[PDB]
Design a protein around this ligand. Structure first.
Ligand code: UTP
Ligand code: MG
Lengths: 308, 332
């Protein structure tokens, strides 16, 4: 059922799904940078021997396979045995410049920000890719939950890096295998961009909303039916001031994924979704997708890591 | 279509609440107060019960002792609002379905009606009644209550109808379906809260012409479904689900909606509403869902005058501007 609605959501999908040239550039930069951090680590373990860096992880768009046409922002997480500091940031950012040279001749600008507790990497392509390397440590969660240098990195910034890392693991386990979920999220990510009313849902809240709504169905759905179920969900008044709200699965304390929305946003987003639903029900879903009426493993965008 | 719209109460385990469910005490009080305003007084149910007894008896008799009378009655059933106990004040009318043995002609419908009222008048010459026929049977009413008699026949006679000699096949089939509804209702929807809600939905549909296309039968199935289809019944105020399922397109194209329990094989009750009407019902409930969230339940329940404007006009709820949902259906 919903053949025509499947045609439109899949064609819109194609329209927003990044190109091989974008993807190939992502693969390259990510691969280069991962393999470079692999060395930056190996180099340290040697200095100590004569641990500190526990791993490198993909998060955000890259990991979730949520890259679309025009996305120039990638992200990684750097795990540190201890609590990352300013000394380690400078040491990594610097040595990273030397280790990249062992993997590629491409030139990357390396810029650090002690405040963002991260190391940004920009390449030289038009437009340029920007990959942010967030440094953090579990020893930080333990501590928030309950005798070190004087240059600890911003706990808030380090705690957020763990959150996204938990979002990335959750997404791969729950959302990925959910049929039409990753597709609906992409096509709805593009709608949150086009319609400023949906803006506030962009990212985590949208991802959760789509997994929840689509996951509560009895059986697997197509892209058409799946997207509808998300409209219905909203149309029911889920994000209204009073009501469950979207509960955050990656939080030990009860957290609302959309608790930041304000009374009017909740009203507008709901009234929009409501209208979008009926439009879909009456064969006008192309209008919700901002397109003209028409006449495998899409989840896997870039290869999994070898280095990590 | 095998498509089931979204229902929060069908999969609640997947949406844990973050902060304790707000206190809807006032809402529950108003819901009961209104049920009380709509409920028939003690004078009203006496007059009805009295008239329903009198007539039902005369008919019971005519069935055991057909006498010399040329109208064979095979069965009589109490159906509709009076039987289910969802009656509203001001409308003291009961529905009786009388299944005739032979073909239900226009002459017979008048003979039976006049024979019935004549029996009441022989028993009680003092009480004044009036008896009128129509195209669906006849009516008998006193000074404060009316009993509608819905004529039909034993199915055997349905395939043998005559477009010009007997009553409309549709009318006869409607009366029979009425019997199945009451049977199903007494059997399945006979719950204290279900009956209270159906009375409130009947009121909502009257103050909001958006809900006009909704029939008594759909309302019955909707109230029962909102209360019972989930272990225990849902609290009366948790009414909110009725609006929420209409809003998520339970009665929209492509949706299973509700299947008729009194028909075969898998009929969608909302299939009797046009596409335009479906759209209308939906977007009406869509506005009322939003309006209830803004704490406008006193208006929704009709305790604050007319609110029919809420569904077509912009309203400001505590600084929040509410824009009513609009037509999305396009007549090709
Ligand atoms: O001609 C017919 C044939 C059949 N029926 C059947 O009888 C029932 C009449 O239903 P009503 O119109 O009386 O609605 P109600 O009793 O639920 O609420 P009130 O307005 O009475 O308070 C309907 O459910 C229909 O199936 C008729 O009403 N008229
Ligand atoms: Mg009635």
């Amino acid at each position: 059922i919903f053949v025509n609605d499947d045609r439109h959501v899949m064609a819109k999908h194609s329209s927003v799904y990044p190109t091989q040239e974008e993807l190939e550039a992502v693969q390259n930069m990510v691969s280069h940078t991962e393999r470079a951090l692999k060395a930056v680590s190996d180099w340290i373990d040697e200095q100590e021997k004569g641990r500190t860096l526990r791993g490198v992880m993909r998060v955000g768009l890259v990991a979730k396979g949520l890259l679309l046409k025009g996305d120039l922002d990638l992200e990684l997480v750097l795990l540190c045995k201890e609590k990352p500091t300013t000394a380690l940031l400078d040491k990594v950012a610097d040595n990273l410049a030397i280790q990249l040279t062992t993997v590629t001749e491409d030139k990357y600008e390396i810029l650090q920000s002690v405040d963002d507790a991260a190391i940004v990497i920009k390449n030289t392509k038009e437009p340029p890719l920007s990959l942010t390397i967030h440094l953090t440590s579990p020893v930080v969660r333990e501590e928030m939950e309950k005798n070190d240098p004087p240059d600890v990195l911003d706990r808030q910034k380090c705690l957020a890096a763990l959150a996204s890392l938990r979002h990335a693991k959750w997404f791969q386990a729950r959302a990925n295998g959910l049929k039409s979920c990753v597709i609906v999220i992409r096509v709805l990510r593009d709608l949150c961009t086009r319609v400023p009313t949906w803006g506030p849902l962009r990212g985590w809240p949208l991802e959760l909303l789509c997994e929840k709504s689509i996951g509560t169905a009895n059986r697997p759905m197509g892209a058409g039916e799946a997207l509808r179920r998300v409209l219905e969900c909203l149309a029911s008044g889920i994000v209204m001031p009073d009501g469950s709200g979207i509960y955050d699965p990656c939080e030990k304390e009860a957290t609302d994924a959309i608790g930041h929305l304000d009374r009017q946003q909740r009203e507008d987003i709901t009234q929009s979704a409501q209208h979008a639903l009926r439009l879909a029900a009456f064969g006008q879903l192309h209008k919700v997708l901002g397109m003209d009426p028409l006449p495998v493993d899409y989840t896997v965008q870039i290869p999994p890591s070898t280095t990590y | 279509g095998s498509h089931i719209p979204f229902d929060f109460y069908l999969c609640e385990m997947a949406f844990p609440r973050v902060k304790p469910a707000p206190d809807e005490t006032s809402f529950s009080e108003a819901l009961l107060k209104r049920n009380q305003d709509l409920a028939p007084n003690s004078a009203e149910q006496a007059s009805i019960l009295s008239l329903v007894t009198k007539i039902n008896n005369v008919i019971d008799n005519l069935i055991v002792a057909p006498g010399t009378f040329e109208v064979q009655i095979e069965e009589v059933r109490q159906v509709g609002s009076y039987k289910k106990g969802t009656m509203t004040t001001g409308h003291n009318v009961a529905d009786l379905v009388v299944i005739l043995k032979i073909l239900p002609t226009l002459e017979a419908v008048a003979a039976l009606g006049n024979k019935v009222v004549e029996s009441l008048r022989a028993q009680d010459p003092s009480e004044v009644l009036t008896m009128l026929t129509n195209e669906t049977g006849f009516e008998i009413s006193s000074s404060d209550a009316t009993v509608k008699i819905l004529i039909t026949t034993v199915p055997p006679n349905l395939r043998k109808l005559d477009p010009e000699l007997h009553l409309d096949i549709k009318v006869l089939q409607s009366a029979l379906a009425a019997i199945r509804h009451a049977r199903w209702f007494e059997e399945n929807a006979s719950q204290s809260t279900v009956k209270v809600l159906i009375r409130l939905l009947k009121d909502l549909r009257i103050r909001f012409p958006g809900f006009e296309p909704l029939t008594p039968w759909i309302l019955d199935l909707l109230g029962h479904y909102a209360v019972m289809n989930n272990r225990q019944p849902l609290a009366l105020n948790v009414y909110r689900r009725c609006l929420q399922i209409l809003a998520a397109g339970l009665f929209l194209p492509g949706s299973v909606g509700i299947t008729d329990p009194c028909e075969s094989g898998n009929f969608r009750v909302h299939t009797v509403m046009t596409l335009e009407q479906q759209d209308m019902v939906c977007y009406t409930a869509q506005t009322l869902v939003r309006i209830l969230s803004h704490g406008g339940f006193r208006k929704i329940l009709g305790q604050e005058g007319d609110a029919s404007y809420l569904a077509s006009e912009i309203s400001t709820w505590d600084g929040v501007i509410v824009t009513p949902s609009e037509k999305a259906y396009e007549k090709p």
